[PDB]
């Protein structure tokens, strides 16, 4: 198991994750925070080799990407009219997570 700096924060206090409407939609938060222009150089002139070496170090250390059993889905509801995942304004696009 992984360690915890703080006791686990779940909606039911055991396993059910905190989500909407208490927390903002993950895609809304991603669009609000991470949207910006590419090509901004690192302020310390850090190299890309360092970034991918750190990715290798992380792959050495931790891995929580493979799904568990039984299969539980925490699906990301795509906000209607998302430029990338719901370009047709269908309003029901859901990214499976």
């Amino acid at each position: 198991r992984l360690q915890r700096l703080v006791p686990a924060s779940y909606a039911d206090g055991v396993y059910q994750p905190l989500g909407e409407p208490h927390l903002p939609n993950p895609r809304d938060l991603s669009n609000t925070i991470s949207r910006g222009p590419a090509g901004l150089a690192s302020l310390r002139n850090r190299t890309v080799l360092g970034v991918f070496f750190g990715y290798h170090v992380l792959s050495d250390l931790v891995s929580v990407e493979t799904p568990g059993c039984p299969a539980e889905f925490l699906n990301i509801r795509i906000p209607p009219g998302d430029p990338m995942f719901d370009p047709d304004q269908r309003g029901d696009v859901v990214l499976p997570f």
Partner: protein, 339 residues
């Protein structure tokens, strides 16, 4: 690129095995493999902790004072999000491939076009690439990554990560940041304020105190993020707060998490190469390993002159060999494949 790093370490292990076979002709397969694995693990630990971490955190581990048998070194759930995000904030839209003579070659796309650099979004899980065919191509990848400057350590993610991350289910593409947020909620990660309090950081009471320099500028991301959270700072999650905290470095929360995690990893490991009690290495071998940087590994594997790489390949400085042509952006690169 992660594949290039893996190939680098694989070839380094094979090279060390060949060196030990030359030194000890009578050794069998198991002895050579174990000695080479020990040396490679020691070099990997030294580079990861004493070279990569000081360069990518601007923080250094305290001096090693011995093995702590009673210290829990397990990876914390917060460390996953912190490390993943402060690495994902620097992924470039493209990656150069560089020659040993400071020549940046063209990259042959699968559309038969020749691009200035290898597009990240179109190379995910690449079974084969026309410009990646031999060991020389992997060496070019490593040299180009050593010469190329990464993206800014800020809240901004490139579209190769934010929109065209490999979708694990029913979609070829997905949002990596949204997936990381859903991971943090899945792991029951604490709030930003609770995470700061548990680590002994000073409490933050206003939204503009998350990143003073960010609120100084004309960027409105703090106000919009507060609007998403209904101005409730107590509900801000650890991952978005760490994204917002970063300025020229990972934020105090993320830097604290990563530094504490690596301190526990080093001190709690009986097989740490500096732990003299495990019998892995002598004092001279430990000193040799400490002297080994990633430049040494790259020079030994690629088999090129040391002047082709800067002394610290994790940071590029003016005067270092082979400057990048220009800071890469989406301009001039192939459009990402649609979802």
């Amino acid at each position: 690129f992660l594949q290039a790093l893996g190939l680098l370490w694989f070839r380094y292990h094979n090279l060390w095995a060949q060196r030990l076979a030359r030194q000890h002709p009578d050794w069998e397969d198991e002895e050579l493999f174990q000695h080479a694995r020990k040396r490679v693990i020691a070099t990997y630990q030294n580079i990861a902790v004493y070279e990569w971490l000081p360069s990518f955190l601007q923080k250094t581990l305290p001096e090693y004072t011995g093995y702590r048998p009673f210290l829990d070194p397990s990876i914390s759930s917060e460390f996953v999000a912190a490390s993943e995000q402060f690495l994902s904030t620097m992924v470039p839209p493209g990656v150069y491939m560089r020659n040993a003579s400071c020549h940046f070659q063209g990259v042959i796309n699968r559309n038969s076009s020749v691009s200035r650099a290898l597009r990240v979004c179109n190379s995910y899980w690449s079974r084969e690439h026309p410009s990646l065919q031999s060991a020389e191509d992997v060496d070019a990848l490593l040299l180009g990554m050593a010469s190329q400057i990464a993206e800014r350590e800020d809240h901004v993610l490139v579209e190769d990560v934010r929109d065209f991350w490999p979708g694990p289910l029913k979609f070829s593409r997905t949002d990596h940041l949204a997936s990381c947020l859903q991971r943090g909620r899945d792991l029951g990660l604490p709030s930003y304020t609770k995470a700061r309090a548990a680590l002994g950081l000073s409490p933050i009471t206003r939204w503009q105190d998350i990143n003073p320099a960010l609120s100084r500028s004309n960027d409105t991301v703090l106000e919009a993020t507060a609007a998403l959270y209904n101005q409730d700072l107590s509900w801000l999650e650890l991952l978005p707060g760490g994204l917002l905290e970063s300025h020229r470095d990972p934020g105090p929360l993320f830097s604290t998490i990563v530094l504490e995690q690596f301190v526990r990893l080093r001190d709690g490991d009986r097989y740490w190469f500096e732990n003299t009690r495990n019998g892995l290495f002598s004092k001279k071998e430990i000193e040799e390993i400490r002297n080994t940087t990633l430049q040494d590994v790259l020079v030994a594997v690629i088999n090129i002159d040391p002047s082709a790489l800067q002394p610290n390949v994790f940071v590029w400085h003016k005067g270092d060999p082979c400057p990048q042509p220009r800071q890469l952006s989406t301009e001039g690169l192939p459009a990402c494949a649609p979802s």
